[PDB]
Amino acid sequence: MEVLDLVTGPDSVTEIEAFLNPRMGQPPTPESLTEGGQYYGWSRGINLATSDTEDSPENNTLPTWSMAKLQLPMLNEDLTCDTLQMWEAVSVKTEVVGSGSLLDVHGFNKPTDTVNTKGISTPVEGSQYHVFAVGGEPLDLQGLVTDARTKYKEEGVVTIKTITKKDMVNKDQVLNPISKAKLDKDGMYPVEIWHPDPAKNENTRYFGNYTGGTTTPPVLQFTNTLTTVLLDENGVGPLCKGEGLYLSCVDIMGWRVTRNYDVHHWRGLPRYFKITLRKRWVK
Amino acid sequence: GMEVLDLVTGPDSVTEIEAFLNPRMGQPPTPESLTEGGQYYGWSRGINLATSDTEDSPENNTLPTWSMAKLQLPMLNTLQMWEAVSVKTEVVGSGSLLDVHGFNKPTDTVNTKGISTPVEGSQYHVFAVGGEPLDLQGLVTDARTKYKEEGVVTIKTITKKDMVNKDQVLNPISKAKLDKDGMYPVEIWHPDPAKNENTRYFGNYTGGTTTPPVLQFTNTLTTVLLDENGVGPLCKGEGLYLSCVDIMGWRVTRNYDVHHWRGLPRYFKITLRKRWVK
Amino acid sequence: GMEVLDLVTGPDSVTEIEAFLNPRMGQPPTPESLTEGGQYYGWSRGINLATSDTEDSPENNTLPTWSMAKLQLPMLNTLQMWEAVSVKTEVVGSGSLLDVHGFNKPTDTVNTKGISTPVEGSQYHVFAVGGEPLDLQGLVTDARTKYKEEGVVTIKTITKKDMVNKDQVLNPISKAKLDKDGMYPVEIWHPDPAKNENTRYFGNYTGGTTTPPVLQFTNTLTTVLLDENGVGPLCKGEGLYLSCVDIMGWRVTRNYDVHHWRGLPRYFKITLRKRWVK
Amino acid sequence: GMEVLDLVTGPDSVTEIEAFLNPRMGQPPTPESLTEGGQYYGWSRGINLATSDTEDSPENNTLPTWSMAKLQLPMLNTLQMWEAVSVKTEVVGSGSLLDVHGFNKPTDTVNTKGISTPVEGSQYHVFAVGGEPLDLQGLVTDARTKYKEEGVVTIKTITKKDMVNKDQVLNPISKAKLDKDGMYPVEIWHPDPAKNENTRYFGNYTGGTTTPPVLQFTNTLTTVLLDENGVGPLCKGEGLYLSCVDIMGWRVTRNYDVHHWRGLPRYFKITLRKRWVK
Amino acid sequence: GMEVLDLVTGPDSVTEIEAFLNPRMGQPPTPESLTEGGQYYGWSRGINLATSDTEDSPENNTLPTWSMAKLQLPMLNTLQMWEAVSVKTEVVGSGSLLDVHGFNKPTDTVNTKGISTPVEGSQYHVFAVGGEPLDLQGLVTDARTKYKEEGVVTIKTITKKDMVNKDQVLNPISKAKLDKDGMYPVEIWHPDPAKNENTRYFGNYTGGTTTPPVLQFTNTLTTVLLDENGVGPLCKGEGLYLSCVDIMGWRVTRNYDVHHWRGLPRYFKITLRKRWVK
Ligand SMILES: CC(=O)N[C@H]1[C@H](O[C@@H]2[C@H](O[C@]3(C(=O)O)C[C@H](O)[C@@H](NC(C)=O)[C@H]([C@H](O)[C@H](O)CO)O3)[C@@H](O)[C@H](O)O[C@@H]2CO)O[C@H](CO)[C@H](O)[C@@H]1O[C@@H]1O[C@H](CO)[C@H](O)[C@H](O[C@]2(C(=O)O)C[C@H](O)[C@@H](NC(C)=O)[C@H]([C@H](O)[C@@H](CO)O[C@]3(C(=O)O)C[C@H](O)[C@@H](NC(C)=O)[C@H]([C@H](O)[C@H](O)CO)O3)O2)[C@H]1O
Ligand SMILES: CC(=O)N[C@H]1[C@H](O[C@@H]2[C@H](O[C@]3(C(=O)O)C[C@H](O)[C@@H](NC(C)=O)[C@H]([C@H](O)[C@H](O)CO)O3)[C@@H](O)[C@H](O)O[C@@H]2CO)O[C@H](CO)[C@H](O)[C@@H]1O[C@@H]1O[C@H](CO)[C@H](O)[C@H](O[C@]2(C(=O)O)C[C@H](O)[C@@H](NC(C)=O)[C@H]([C@H](O)[C@@H](CO)O[C@]3(C(=O)O)C[C@H](O)[C@@H](NC(C)=O)[C@H]([C@H](O)[C@H](O)CO)O3)O2)[C@H]1O
Ligand SMILES: CC(=O)N[C@H]1[C@H](O[C@@H]2[C@H](O)[C@@H](O)[C@H](O)O[C@@H]2CO)O[C@H](CO)[C@H](O)[C@@H]1O[C@@H]1O[C@H](CO)[C@H](O)[C@H](O[C@]2(C(=O)O)C[C@H](O)[C@@H](NC(C)=O)[C@H]([C@H](O)[C@@H](CO)O[C@]3(C(=O)O)C[C@H](O)[C@@H](NC(C)=O)[C@H]([C@H](O)[C@H](O)CO)O3)O2)[C@H]1O
Ligand SMILES: CC(=O)N[C@H]1[C@H](O[C@@H]2[C@H](O)[C@@H](O)[C@H](O)O[C@@H]2CO)O[C@H](CO)[C@H](O)[C@@H]1O[C@@H]1O[C@H](CO)[C@H](O)[C@H](O[C@]2(C(=O)O)C[C@H](O)[C@@H](NC(C)=O)[C@H]([C@H](O)[C@@H](CO)O[C@]3(C(=O)O)C[C@H](O)[C@@H](NC(C)=O)[C@H]([C@H](O)[C@H](O)CO)O3)O2)[C@H]1O
Ligand SMILES: CC(=O)N[C@H]1[C@H](O[C@@H]2[C@H](O)[C@@H](O)[C@H](O)O[C@@H]2CO)O[C@H](CO)[C@H](O)[C@@H]1O[C@@H]1O[C@H](CO)[C@H](O)[C@H](O[C@]2(C(=O)O)C[C@H](O)[C@@H](NC(C)=O)[C@H]([C@H](O)[C@@H](CO)O[C@]3(C(=O)O)C[C@H](O)[C@@H](NC(C)=O)[C@H]([C@H](O)[C@H](O)CO)O3)O2)[C@H]1O
């Protein structure tokens, strides 16, 4: 694809917006606040391996990637034309919303005074993971796991075995180029398995950060004044193949810890995207 | 006043206004008495905890809320509007946290010695300047939390219905405007990134229980409020809206580790200029 | 005095002045005797704690206060004024905190072994350069604190009335000027962002009890003092005011965890030029 | 090609090459079997400790080593050489550390509950791109350490003599080249700043035992490899050398707190251009 | 030559010189024997503590001291002087801190298991490049500290009198020059910001007892030594002075938590140019 001039004229630039809700483990339904809906925005209680050779995490304890495909206005009446137009993502304003809610320390989490069961309800703390991507095709994924012996469910999550039709190999604990996928479904690809593939993603920009630990304070900034530029070193943004725009993210804030067996629940927050796009002549 | 034209020139075409917004941590400014509750002003009252997984009823005076003020600008009226160009803002009083001589939980609890533990823990700093109220998006830890119906504005105040599970993530139904001081809890109401076209807001959060508080202050830092097109917030009906919350953490008492939120006041000095509009 | 014109050129139109300000942590410079109290110079005396929720009376020698100096500039005299253009400032002596061979509370309390615990905890660094005293805004942790009525300047010194609940937030009545060294407690008096038009100040605070102290120092960093219009502080009556406080944390003794504040001295090298004024 | 001339223009004058380097934490890639040792690939084997002050004999499979690869470039031959201009490099797989559901030491050891403690502690990230092997300088914690003679390249491998006390500081005798993958221990061999004229390296270290691991990753960051004269690494005999190590910390087992190092793979995409040389 | 003129052009008008300065943590380079004390080279000997508030006598070999070297430049002599333009500097060997397989205090003290605790705690990194010795200002934790009279240069060495209480803050009488390697304790002697007109120095301090050490290293970073007028240090008598200290923290033994300071060597590569002076 040869990238030519910017298209000018009426409606040559557009802005589109979307929010992607977190996918921490509990699905959006049931909505009932007694039947499981109370866990929406969180994982269910993390379940642990029972031995070095018996690690079977439940699907609803595994945070997964959020994604959305946005369909842009059709540009080309005839794809056989020598010169065509594509939507180009120029920039994005993105924000993780709701960090203020972590200031709720009046609930029933493990308390800070364990002698008297007093103090405050311990706020969300621990490992944090924030990634977002904007591209003109699905985010390319590279698999890499802690333990190739982990017995992921065969139904309900897309894992390395889903792709290869074979059990994971020891190479999957490092970089195994066979273990690749595309982020083509929301709430299905676990973030402890699937990472942005630096060997592909030519038509996507992604930005990630990880902070580990168990009691690490969560940190977040938010403003409506920060623009993320999506143009590459040549001044070209992601080009939307068949007018499809792909948004991908995960925003883990840490865990809350309950008063029962120190059970941990992952917490995630929703992410806003406002993408500025322009029409680009291509051949 | 939709089409933004040239800057207005001449006498009184630029103005500076200043204000301080005091924190709204839970204890109201009155009663002033230092024995009848006034001693908690600048702080929350002691945080009260849920009694079960289904019984979380926080008292209003334990919930920090947004501070806000609407300032009236000089009368103006191709019309003219006041345009907010920049702001110098500062959180005042961090030095007061150096008081470690009080009666808080001491650092040596065995012998009741050491120092009075200073304010520590979760911190939250947001400010906004706009030409209309800050647009708010609701999102809570727990849609089952039983907020009081009177004395605070919560999601149910707006919807007239109980919160739903979607309120623990992003539910576009749960929106409000920051139109009252000391009423909108910060654990519920967040700046809405899908609106606020005419407001600039800047926020940061640092969590934890014993995290050291950190603050910088200088009179030399200017925050520019102009957008990508060089246009600042435009003050509808000559009203300028200031919004903030500045939580430094908690102090902890010697009685069952009772926590009190600590907030500090924020200064604003806004430069505004008249703008031609059509 | 008010209208700022061109820079003055010619012989001696620019000058550099330097000063060091020693910390004022609570123990005065005298007695010099290393047995009669002088051993605490550079530090506070042992921090004394409240005996109840209503009885908090800190001793003056436990309260760090602002350091300040007024320097006299060469006589001058459309008139001329000295204008402060820039400053190189440095906090000196952080290397001294590497002394872990003393008699502080040891790191192994089981065997009374390990190292002498180094200075740690809450840190506070502010400096200012101006053409008149630093304007101060009072704000306290506790309006009930019984500060001494002798040997220190507090809110009550200024107002002639006891503190009120508003003094725990921003009370605009509670203002002062930094006009004396070692007299204004830093837990009471903060730079006033509503004034200080003719001063530049820069501050930071890091809290906690065991927080590692952090400091950088170099002779290669210049702080510009010119405002947005290219004008530095103008020295009224040829007086230049320097203000600072540099708290590094506390050391802790082996006797009931008694804490002593540690401060360090700050160097200033100010570059000034003559400015025509009308 | 000592003298560097103009850039070569025309067809095929610029190229991009990519590679990934897997970590070398101690367990080799084979056996592949997940019961026969393959389950430790990407990790070290359990770190074994000294039995006395004079008996420190670490096993080879407990010692992380440098990763390296030599890539062959298109044949070229006033002569031409490949010049590395820039690199995009990324450490892949930090999300895998979010697995806290395994059988590591649990966060609640009193009841054996909570979560599986994630990887924490000392972290070390270095990468280099050059036109010849990375030059290494030896420096160790303890010159008395009894490294194996076979299976690792250590100081004694090079000198044919035991380590001396100078090897605990900078001993210029103790030098080597990174010419083999998975053989040079990172606790011994460091980039040599006195050499490496034709390589660029970038490193950082963060220590401690329970330190939270931190990592950023993006496909939008380019590292320029040009020196102060605008010249990148020149590839001798069309060979491009990539070198790295990326230690994230340790996992800790439920059996006597045995630690295993964790490494992650590093991606490189290098842009090269032809350069005229004389 | 006080007046600085044009740069000198022509053959050999620019030169580049390199050196490494080994750390001076307390144990001298000799004896070399790894049983007779050489095993501590690169480290201090075990830190010895005060026995009372009035009895603090640290041994010389427990006190880290400044490293320094004077390098002789090519002979030169309107005269010419060598001017230091820039320096590439690097602290080498942080990877050696990844040795957690030795006999230090273990991470699991209950069972004496886990890993050998890595170096942690207070860190101090300073370097300087100048045309004369680094100017030093004395400042101590405790003016009562009984430093040895022989084998170290301390305040009393210079003044011929015991330290005074002012030595715990800034006492202008307590000054020296860094004219000897491994002799000036870093807990006493600091770069003097009131002098050093012909030297650039850059320092940082991070305190605490278990703080994770942090270090970055690269061969791509240049430190410019030119002042605000574009003039670098001028080498008096063709002598170039390099000064540094690089403390990474302590290791802790299994015997009564004895601490040993760890230091690392520093590389310098200085670019110099001939300058016309009069
Ligand atoms: C309860 C249990 O042992 N669950 C266990 C499961 O055991 C199977 C059988 O349980 C059920 C069930 O989930 O209730 C019976 C159902 O009929 C069946 N549903 C259907 C549609 O067929 C399901 C279903 O088979 C399965 O869940 C699908 O995976 O199973 C049990 O009766 C029988 O003895 O054994 C059965 C098979 O072993 O088996 C699972 C493995 O297949 C799991 O082992 C499961 O344990 C749960 O695992 C999740 C992670 O997957 C998690 O760790 C969970 O721990 C939490 C949690 O839900 O996240 C941690 C929370 O902190 C904790 N909350 C509080 C406040 O303490 C929460 C509660 O303990 C739950 C446990 O379900 O109790 C409540 C609750 O949420 O508070 C109690 C409420 O009164 C109740 N509401 C009502 C209206 O009754 C809710 C409600 O049922 C659920 O929220 C709906 O999902 O549950 O545990 C860990 O328990
Ligand atoms: C005391 C109590 O049980 N409060 C409790 C409340 O109980 C109701 C009745 O108490 C009162 C009351 O607040 O005193 C009686 C009043 O007549 C009534 N007023 C009116 C106009 O009708 C109020 C009012 O109805 C209610 O507050 C409004 O909701 O109620 C009590 O007599 C009866 O037995 O039960 C009644 C309800 O059934 O009910 C509330 C819920 O409705 C709360 O449960 C409330 O508990 C307080 O809750 C807040 C959070 O909202 C907070 O956790 C508070 O804990 C603190 C605090 O005040 O923040 C934590 C502080 O750290 C702690 N300070 C110290 C130094 O220890 C502080 C003290 O323990 C308070 C307790 O009130 O004692 C002092 C004080 O501030 O130090 C003691 C002083 O001597 C006293 N001053 C004087 C001059 O006497 C002050 C002063 O009363 C108050 O500050 C004024 O507000 O109180 O507690 C937690 O107690
Ligand atoms: C000693 C005492 O009780 N002082 C308190 C004072 O008591 C009054 C009077 O002095 C008593 O004789 C009488 O019984 O009671 C009256 C009451 O009116 O009352 C004051 C209020 O007016 C205070 O309560 C005062 O207590 C002191 O308060 C300060 C804060 O204001 C400190 O908290 C102080 O504690 C320290 C300190 O000096 O900072 C903490 C420090 O860590 C301690 N140092 C050591 C090594 O342990 C010292 C130490 O305990 C002092 C107490 O004064 O003893 C020495 C010293 O080491 O400094 C012992 C020396 O032998 C002595 N020097 C000589 C030559 O004799 C030296 C010297 O007197 C003083 O330093 C000079 O100021 O004191 O305490 C807290 O005690
Ligand atoms: C087993 C043993 O003692 N090994 C040590 C070795 O002993 C020699 C010989 O093997 C013995 O039978 C005999 O008695 O003694 C001779 C020598 O005299 O000698 C070596 C020195 O030459 C070492 O001392 C060695 O000890 C091992 O040293 C390495 C470092 O080099 C590690 O510290 C290792 O500890 C681990 C490890 O493997 O990394 C720590 C780890 O966390 C442990 N894992 C778990 C789940 O607990 C393992 C574990 O204890 C190993 C011990 O080898 O057991 C398994 C395993 O889980 O990995 C058990 C499996 O069932 C087995 N698989 C099969 C199919 O049988 C598996 C497999 O043998 C190995 O992984 C292949 O390498 O081992 O220990 C430390 O033990
Ligand atoms: C041993 C002793 O008591 N030394 C103190 C010295 O005593 C003098 C004399 O040596 C004694 O025989 C006699 O009884 O008393 C006189 C003086 O009255 O006096 C000094 C003051 O003048 C000191 O008090 C000195 O104590 C030593 O002080 C230094 C600081 O100056 C250190 O704190 C030192 O502690 C360490 C150290 O050396 O740094 C801490 C370290 O962690 C320890 N290492 C280990 C592995 O445990 C060592 C260790 O205990 C030393 C003590 O010297 O023993 C060895 C060693 O391991 O280094 C044992 C070796 O076998 C030996 N080698 C040989 C071939 O014999 C080796 C060697 O002598 C020394 O390294 C040479 O310097 O010493 O202690 C603290 O002990």
Side-chain angles (χ1 to χ4, degrees), chain E residues 12-74 76-149 151-196 198-227 229-262:
Chain E
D12 306 306
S13 51
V14 173
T15 196
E16 190 178 289
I17 65 165
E18 57 169 35
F20 61 93
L21 277 56
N22 274 321
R24 301 290 175 242
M25 296 296 102
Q27 177 65 22
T30 69
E32 300 181 338
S33 152
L34 288 166
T35 57
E36 288 167 10
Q39 68 268 40
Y40 305 102
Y41 183 39
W43 309 81
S44 75
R45 301 297 287 257
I47 290 161
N48 73 289
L49 308 182
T51 56
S52 83
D53 174 63
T54 60
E55 293 295 345
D56 179 29
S57 304
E59 298 288 341
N60 289 349
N61 60 13
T62 69
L63 298 168
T65 49
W66 282 92
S67 302
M68 73 78 49
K70 180 188 183 192
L71 304 176
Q72 194 54 225
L73 302 169
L76 289 180
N77 306 293
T78 314
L79 305 158
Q80 298 181 359
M81 291 184 80
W82 285 109
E83 172 188 16
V85 174
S86 59
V87 60
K88 288 184 140 181
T89 185
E90 184 167 329
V91 179
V92 178
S94 66
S96 73
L97 301 185
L98 299 166
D99 172 2
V100 298
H101 60 75
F103 207 61
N104 302 343
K105 183 182 191 173
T107 52
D108 171 9
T109 56
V110 169
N111 305 294
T112 314
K113 298 286 178 165
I115 54 165
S116 186
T117 304
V119 166
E120 298 177 331
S122 291
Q123 302 150 57
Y124 190 63
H125 293 285
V126 194
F127 73 97
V129 180
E132 58 206 66
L134 176 67
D135 294 302
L136 302 167
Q137 167 68 55
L139 187 153
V140 300
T141 285
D142 194 344
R144 299 170 304 169
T145 295
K146 304 180 175 188
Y147 295 107
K148 296 286 183 183
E149 299 196 80
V152 278
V153 179
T154 65
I155 291 172
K156 180 165 178 177
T157 309
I158 303 303
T159 67
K160 317 300 170 190
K161 288 174 187 168
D162 286 324
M163 285 185 286
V164 294
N165 79 327
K166 296 185 200 75
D167 291 327
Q168 300 179 182
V169 295
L170 202 299
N171 177 7
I173 295 164
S174 301
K175 291 187 179 206
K177 296 177 181 185
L178 181 52
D179 59 1
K180 286 164 178 177
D181 181 67
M183 291 294 282
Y184 290 79
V186 299
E187 77 170 40
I188 300 171
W189 299 109
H190 317 287
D192 184 358
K195 297 185 80 174
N196 286 308
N198 199 34
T199 290
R200 316 298 181 247
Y201 63 82
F202 312 83
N204 60 70
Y205 169 77
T206 292
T209 62
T210 60
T211 313
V214 171
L215 200 80
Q216 301 87 42
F217 50 100
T218 181
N219 65 342
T220 66
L221 201 148
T222 300
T223 304
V224 173
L225 300 169
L226 303 185
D227 64 20
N229 303 314
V231 184
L234 297 167
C235 297
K236 299 184 172 170
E238 285 75 75
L240 176 68
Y241 285 82
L242 312 180
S243 304
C244 62
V245 50
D246 293 284
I247 292 166
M248 299 301 296
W250 309 277
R251 71 170 153 102
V252 183
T253 78
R254 292 179 175 207
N255 322 297
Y256 291 124
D257 281 18
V258 171
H259 284 50
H260 294 261
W261 292 106
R262 175 51 153 157

Side-chain angles (χ1 to χ4, degrees), chain D residues 146-164:
Chain D
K146 303 167 177 201
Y147 295 106
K148 299 287 186 179
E149 288 189 291
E150 299 292 326
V152 277
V153 183
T154 67
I155 291 173
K156 185 171 174 174
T157 311
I158 306 304
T159 66
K160 323 293 181 198
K161 286 166 184 175
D162 287 314
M163 286 189 283
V164 293

Side-chain angles (χ1 to χ4, degrees), chain C residues 21-72:
Chain C
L21 277 60
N22 278 319
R24 296 295 175 239
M25 295 297 104
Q27 178 66 20
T30 65
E32 296 185 335
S33 166
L34 289 171
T35 62
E36 297 283 5
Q39 69 268 45
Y40 306 101
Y41 186 40
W43 311 78
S44 75
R45 299 300 285 258
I47 290 167
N48 70 293
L49 303 187
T51 53
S52 81
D53 175 61
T54 58
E55 296 292 342
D56 174 31
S57 198
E59 300 288 349
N60 286 341
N61 62 9
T62 72
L63 297 170
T65 50
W66 285 91
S67 302
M68 69 79 75
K70 179 192 191 188
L71 308 179
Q72 266 297 314

